[PDB]
Amino acid sequence: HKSEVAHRFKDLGEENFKALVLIAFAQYLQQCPFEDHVKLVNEVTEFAKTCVADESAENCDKSLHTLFGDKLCTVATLRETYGEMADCCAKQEPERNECFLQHKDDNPNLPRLVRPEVDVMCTAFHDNEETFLKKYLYEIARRHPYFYAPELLFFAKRYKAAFTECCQAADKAACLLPKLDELRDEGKASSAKQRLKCASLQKFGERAFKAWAVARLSQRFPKAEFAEVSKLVTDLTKVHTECCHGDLLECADDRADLAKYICENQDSISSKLKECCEKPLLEKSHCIAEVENDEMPADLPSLAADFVESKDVCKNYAEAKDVFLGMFLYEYARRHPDYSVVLLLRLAKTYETTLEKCCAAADPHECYAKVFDEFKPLVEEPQNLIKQNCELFEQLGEYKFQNALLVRYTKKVPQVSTPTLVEVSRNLGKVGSKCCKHPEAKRMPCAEDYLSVVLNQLCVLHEKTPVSDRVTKCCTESLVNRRPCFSALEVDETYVPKEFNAETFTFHADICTLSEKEEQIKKQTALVELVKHKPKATKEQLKAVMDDFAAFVEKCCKADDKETCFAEEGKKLVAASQAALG
Numbered sequence: 001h002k003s004e005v006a007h008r009f010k011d012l013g014e015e016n017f018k019a020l021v022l023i024a025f026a027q028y029l030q031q032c033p034f035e036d037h038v039k040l041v042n043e044v045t046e047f048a049k050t051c052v053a054d055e056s057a058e059n060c061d062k063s064l065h066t067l068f069g070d071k072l073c074t075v076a077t078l079r080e081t082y083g084e085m086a087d088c089c090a091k092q093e094p095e096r097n098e099c100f101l102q103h104k105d106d107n108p109n110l111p112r113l114v115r116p117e118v119d120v121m122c123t124a125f126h127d128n129e130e131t132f133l134k135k136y137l138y139e140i141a142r143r144h145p146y147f148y149a150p151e152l153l154f155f156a157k158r159y160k161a162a163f164t165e166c167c168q169a170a171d172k173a174a175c176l177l178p179k180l181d182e183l184r185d186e187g188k189a190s191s192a193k194q195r196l197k198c199a200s201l202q203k204f205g206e207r208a209f210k211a212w213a214v215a216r217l218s219q220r221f222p223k224a225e226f227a228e229v230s231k232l233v234t235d236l237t238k239v240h241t242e243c244c245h246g247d248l249l250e251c252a253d254d255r256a257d258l259a260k261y262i263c264e265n266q267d268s269i270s271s272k273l274k275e276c277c278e279k280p281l282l283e284k285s286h287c288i289a290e291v292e293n294d295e296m297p298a299d300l301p302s303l304a305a306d307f308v309e310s311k312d313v314c315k316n317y318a319e320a321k322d323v324f325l326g327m328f329l330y331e332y333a334r335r336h337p338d339y340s341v342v343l344l345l346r347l348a349k350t351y352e353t354t355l356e357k358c359c360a361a362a363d364p365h366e367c368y369a370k371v372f373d374e375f376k377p378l379v380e381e382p383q384n385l386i387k388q389n390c391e392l393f394e395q396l397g398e399y400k401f402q403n404a405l406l407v408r409y410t411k412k413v414p415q416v417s418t419p420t421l422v423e424v425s426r427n428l429g430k431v432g433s434k435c436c437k438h439p440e441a442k443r444m445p446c447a448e449d450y451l452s453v454v455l456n457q458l459c460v461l462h463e464k465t466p467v468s469d470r471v472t473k474c475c476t477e478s479l480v481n482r483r484p485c486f487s488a489l490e491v492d493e494t495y496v497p498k499e500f501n502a503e504t505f506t507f508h509a510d511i512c513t514l515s516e517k518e519e520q521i522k523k524q525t526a527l528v529e530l531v532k533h534k535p536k537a538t539k540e541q542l543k544a545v546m547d548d549f550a551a552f553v554e555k556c557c558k559a560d561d562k563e564t565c566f567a568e569e570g571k572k573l574v575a576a577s578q579a580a581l582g
């Protein structure tokens with residue numbers, strides 16, 4: 001209406017408004033202190049209430065971008081603290097806003113956030129729930145400038161619910177810790193998937209994104225009409241562009257418009273949207289973006305009909321290439337909620353390639369008649385890997401599965417630094433303990449989401465510290481060919497062994513007093529180093545050394561005078577194993 005900020009306040013509610021304003025300011029003024037931001041919040045809230053009481057009160061008719069900018073430019077220490085950013089204030093809207101966005105540092109130099117002790121967190125939570133939570137909201141938001149604010153708020157409420165439930169429990173740490181680790185990972189994953197989609201929209205262009213969206217959206221709303229899914233893909237593409245551009249307000253509006261649309265037409269999109277569409281303005285959007293796939297129609301034809309058998313394939317294709325390929329994807333995607341998105345994209349690209357060659361030949365239909373037969377090996381490839389790897393994880397547990405990945409990948413890319421190989425194989429291991437718990441129908445999508453985040457985490461690291469051309473190839477290659485590229489890595493036959501370093505394989509008794517995690521990684525670090533010293537060893541040989549080491553440790557940690565044992569037997573293990581591995 002006459003006042004946008006009064007309208008947002010009524011929609012949001014005071015509680016959500018204040019949290020959102022805090023997050024928004026923390027994302028732009030990343031270096032200002034908490035107490036400074038808390039004052040900005042109170043001043044904007046008081047102002048908003050003014051407009052709520054009188055829609056025509058001073059400044060109340062000014063747009064949200066202008067109001068937000070003026071407050072930003074109010075910070076007096078602006079130039080001494082952010083320097084160049086201060087010059088933005090001399091500019092006029094909307095050029096001023098653009099100027100602020102260009103200075104959002106996607107990676108500030110702040111200390112790592114450390115997890116305090118359970119008793120300190122709980123006591124602080126109890127003595128002042130609000131500052132405890134708002135303080136951390138601030139610390140997280142300023143470190144992650146592009147993380148969609150409303151989503152950062154949903155996490156805050158889960159966090160709150162974990163402290164309420166656990167700080168009351170008998171064993172607090174036993175209840176809270178695993179919840180914190182689970183919320184952290186989930187936050188790491190959402191972050192990674194977000195920057196991943198933006199990076200793709202920026203590098204590979206709009207088309208590649210619209211393609212990803214048609215596939216994903218068709219699995220989720222299989223009953224929807226193709227004309228409806230195209231509408232949604234178009235609006236969703238605009239939403240991400242603007243949300244990637246970093247403009248919170250613009251992003252928020254497009255998301256709200258889109259969520260109401262889906263709800264008003266929910267009866268012709270999906271049946272799983274009833275729940276979501278009741279929920280509060282701030283949750284509709286989030287719920288709809290994560291909504292489970294709808295049941296697919298039971299009366300559905302065979303793709304081969306319209307895309308292989310019909311004789312007008314090329315006529316329909318040349319009439320509007322992308323659209324035709326869109327309908328293919330839509331058709332294939334909606335009958336396969338069990339396929340990962342990039343698999344569907346690989347099939348569509350195979351089909352495109354085929355049609356490009358065939359439609360320019362004497363007899364089209366003969367050339368492209370056996371295309372569905374060319375998909376078979378593309379589909380079986382990722383499924384076979386899921387079966388093979390999840391079965392292995394069943395036999396060995398998570399830890400031993402992780403060690404198997406360790407030997408496997410250290411051998412493929414011996415150059416990567418040991419700490420990186422250990423971290424990567426560990427997370428790969430956890431993707432196994434997470435997705436293998438699911439039924440065959442929901443595994444590929446699961447693996448795709450968690451694998452995608454582990455892969456760029458790996459690529460980023462390698463982007464900074466290059467060490468292998470094959471890794472760089474996989475890392476810069478199409479985002480659809482990324483996983484197949486890593487799976488195709490072969491054992492490195494060129495690699496020359498690291499000369500033996502006695503220190504690397506000397507273990508002291510401190511390994512006994514150490515915690516499980518720190519203990520596993522001390523052993524896993526030694527394992528990578530073993531393989532890097534004897535890359536020709538066989539599963540049987542290594543397995544023998546690990547069984548020996550295993551014993552070694554256990555024995556020397558339950559015996560009087562540890563330090564001696566580890567030094568006496570240590571020489572024996574190392575001496576013998578060198579002989580075994582020749």
Ligand SMILES: CN(C)c1cccc2c(S(=O)(=O)N[C@@H](CC(N)=O)C(=O)O)cccc12
Pocket residue numbers: 111112113140152155183184186187188191
């Ligand atoms: C839910 N969401 C917002 C998160 C909650 C708690 C910690 C999170 C972290 S993190 O701080 O634990 N870890 C970050 C950076 C760091 N300080 O170590 C990282 O390893 O990339 C990253 C991303 C999201 C997080």
Ligand SMILES: CN(C)c1cccc2c(S(=O)(=O)N[C@@H](CC(N)=O)C(=O)O)cccc12
Pocket residue numbers: 193216217236239254255256258259284285286288289290
């Ligand atoms: C509610 N409106 C505005 C939406 C916002 C963001 C993503 C949406 C999606 S989605 O399929 O891209 N959903 C994303 C989740 C996300 N990153 O937000 C995904 O599964 O990868 C579908 C339908 C509506 C969406």
Ligand SMILES: CCCCCCCCCCCCCC(=O)O
Pocket residue numbers: 113114115116133136137140152155156157159180181184
């Ligand atoms: C998502 C914002 C809510 C803030 C509540 C977080 C409180 C827990 C602090 C622990 C953060 C340290 C990071 C970690 O978990 O290792």
Ligand SMILES: CCCCCCCCCCCCCC(=O)O
Pocket residue numbers: 204207208210211214230322323325326329345348349352478479480
């Ligand atoms: C409205 C329809 C837009 C979708 C166009 C379909 C094109 C499918 C080809 C797949 C391209 C893969 C993109 C990539 O390189 O990642």
Ligand SMILES: CCCCCCCCCCCCCC(=O)O
Pocket residue numbers: 005008020021024044064067068150249252253255256259281282283284285286
């Ligand atoms: C001057 C400060 C203005 C406050 C900024 C908060 C505006 C965000 C609107 C929230 C809309 C929710 C959109 C969604 O569903 O994702």
Ligand SMILES: CCCCCCCCCCCCCC(=O)O
Pocket residue numbers: 403505523524526527530533545546547549550573574577578
């Ligand atoms: C060259 C001989 C060095 C011998 C050192 C052995 C180091 C490998 C031990 C790795 C740990 C095995 C895994 C486990 O015990 O769970």
